[PDB]
Amino acid sequence: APDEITTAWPVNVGPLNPHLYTPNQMFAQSMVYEPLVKYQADGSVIPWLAKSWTHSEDGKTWTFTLRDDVKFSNGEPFDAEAAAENFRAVLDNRQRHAWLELANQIVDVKALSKTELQITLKSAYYPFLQELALPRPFRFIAPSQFKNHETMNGIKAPIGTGPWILQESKLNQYDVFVRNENYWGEKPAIKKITFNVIPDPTTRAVAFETGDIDLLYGNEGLLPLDTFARFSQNPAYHTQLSQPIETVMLALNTAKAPTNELAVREALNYAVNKKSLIDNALYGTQQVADTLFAPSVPYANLGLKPSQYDPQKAKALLEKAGWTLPAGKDIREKNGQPLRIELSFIGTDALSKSMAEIIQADMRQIGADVSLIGEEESSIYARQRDGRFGMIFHRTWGAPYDPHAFLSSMRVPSHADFQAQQGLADKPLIDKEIGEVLATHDETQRQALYRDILTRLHDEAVYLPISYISMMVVSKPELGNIPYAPIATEIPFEQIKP
Ligand SMILES: Cc1cccc(CN(C)[C@H]2CCCC[C@@H]2N(CC(=O)O)Cc2cccc(C)n2)n1
Numbered sequence: 394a395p396d397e398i399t400t401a402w403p404v405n406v407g408p409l410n411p412h413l414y415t416p417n418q419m420f421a422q423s424m425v426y427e428p429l430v431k432y433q434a435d436g437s438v439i440p441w442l443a444k445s446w447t448h449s450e451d452g453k454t455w456t457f458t459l460r461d462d463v464k465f466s467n468g469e470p471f472d473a474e475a476a477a478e479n480f481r482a483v484l485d486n487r488q489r490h491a492w493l494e495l496a497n498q499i500v501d502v503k504a505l506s507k508t509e510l511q512i513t514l515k516s517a518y519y520p521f522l523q524e525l526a527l528p529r530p531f532r533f534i535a536p537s538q539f540k541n542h543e544t545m546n547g548i549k550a551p552i553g554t555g556p557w558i559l560q561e562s563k564l565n566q567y568d569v570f571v572r573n574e575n576y577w578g579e580k581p582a583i584k585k586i587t588f589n590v591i592p593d594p595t596t597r598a599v600a601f602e603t604g605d606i607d608l609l610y611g612n613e614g615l616l617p618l619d620t621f622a623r624f625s626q627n628p629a630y631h632t633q634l635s636q637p638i639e640t641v642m643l644a645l646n647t648a649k650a651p652t653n654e655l656a657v658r659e660a661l662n663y664a665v666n667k668k669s670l671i672d673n674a675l676y677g678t679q680q681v682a683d684t685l686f687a688p689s690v691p692y693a694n695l696g697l698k699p700s701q702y703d704p705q706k707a708k709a710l711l712e713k714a715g716w717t718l719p720a721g722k723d724i725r726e727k728n729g730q731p732l733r734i735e736l737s738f739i740g741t742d743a744l745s746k747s748m749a750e751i752i753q754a755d756m757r758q759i760g761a762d763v764s765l766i767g768e769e770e771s772s773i774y775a776r777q778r779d780g781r782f783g784m785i786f787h788r789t790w791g792a793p794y795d796p797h798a799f800l801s802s803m804r805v806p807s808h809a810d811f812q813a814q815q816g817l818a819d820k821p822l823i824d825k826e827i828g829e830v831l832a833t834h835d836e837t838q839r840q841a842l843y844r845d846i847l848t849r850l851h852d853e854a855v856y857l858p859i860s861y862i863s864m865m866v867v868s869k870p871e872l873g874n875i876p877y878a879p880i881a882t883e884i885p886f887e888q889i890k891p
């Protein structure tokens with residue numbers, strides 16, 4: 394059946410609560426649940442569940458006119474009351490969404506009629522529409538599936554308005570979705586999608602080679618990159634590599650010795666040949682990153698000066714900061730303390746380990762001793778929240794989060810970016826300007842604030858940008874060309890057309 398496909402994912406999709414995070418998988422929430430406005434690749438949003446909208450002079454009161462023909466997959470109507478109830482359910486858990494500034498901005502949501510939905514904001518929050526378009530949390534489950542009129546304590550059935558319906562889930566085995574035959578929009582050509590739960594990238598590759606699965610879709614960890622290169626040459630297969638979607642980097646802890654020293658952070662940024670790293674560990678499949686955000690990211694084309702690979706300059710910077718080589722040793726010392734930096738990473742991630750070994754070797758060449766701390770996933774996430782790291786692998790979030798939402802989250806102390814920035818003397822200024830950039834409606838001032846925030850982060854060498862990574866696809870040829878979604882975390886199954 395050419396209208397039924399089998400793919401894979403490292404874990405189950407989760408319960409598909411539209412308003413919660415782990416272990417819900419974002420792409421799967423986006424398959425079932427829909428936004429008021431839909432994000433487009435050009436950076437705009439289009440009408441979706443909302444046909445149209447107006448806003449007040451002061452930018453704080455927004456009124457959406459909703460479609461009147463939309464049903465949840467269980468036949469119950471989608472109207473302004475159902476939408477308002479969803480906003481209430483989300484904001485009843487407001488603390489958990491405070492990383493996303495819109496969750497702190499919404500004062501009230503009212504259904505003025507079946508088709509009129511009014512949303513009032515604290516301030517004139519410019520990324521309002523783009524954050525409504527995110528996969529979560531502002532998407533809509535049928536209110537009949539709330540538990541005690543809430544969603545934060547669980548849901549009943551995951552009933553959305555979207556083009557896919559979860560048929561069944563089997564923990565550690567599979568998830569099955571089917572086409573919504575009563576979808577308000579266009580019918581997908583695919584009728585059934587089976588997700589096999591396959592946690593290991595080599596095992597995913599083997600599953601494709603045997604014919605067990607029709608499609609692999611993911612980022613640079615989807616499968617071994619040496620295997621992907623071979624697949625791309627195989628005339629029996631189809632492969633794709635998108636244009637870059639987000640940045641992979643190291644975050645350097647400005648609050649912990651010795652990365653608290655600007656000279657040390659600058660020297661680290663001169664010591665890595667990123668092209669060689671990409672050609673070594675990533676088999677040349679990704680692009681070199683000189684800045685936190687690629688120049689193609691909105692508001693980020695600033696002409697920031699790259700720190701090109703220059704081990705001679707890296708050594709000179711350390712020497713001038715007092716980090717010199719003792720007799721017969723390769724690791725520098727200052728006041729008898731060795732230049733030692735801990736790099737923690739997920740120890741079972743072979744790609745992360747490979748890049749870690751490359752970074753360790755590169756930094757030894759300029760006299761810095763990198764200790765590799767490979768730990769389980771839970772421990773690494775705890776380290777990121779607590780700032781218990783010297784260096785960590787880190788990534789941006791792709792459109793439409795980059796740059797406004799990623800920057801906004803830098804103010805939240807329980808995440809890696811704040812922790813890495815905590816030792817900066819101008820961190821209060823940076824957090825102040827991040828608050829201003831989200832609220833100001835002077836577009837000249839908005840661009841000037843983005844420039845200042847990103848220039849400070851660049852000049853202070855908080856990050857060591859490594860690569861701009863791409864989405865990758867491996868598929869049976871009969872599926873045809875596989876499209877990409879405007880939102881980097883979504884998979885546009887409804888656009889596959891065999
Ligand atoms: C905690 C954490 C930190 C860093 C990265 C991640 C991984 N998540 C999935 C990223 C993936 C890419 C898009 C953004 C997305 N989330 C939003 C979301 O999960 O909906 C960022 C975020 C920020 C703050 C809190 C939470 C829970 N999440 N999780």
Ligand SMILES: [Fe+3]
Binds near residue numbers: 414
């Ligand atoms: Fe997240």
Ligand SMILES: [Mg+2]
Binds near residue numbers: 699702
């Ligand atoms: Mg560079």
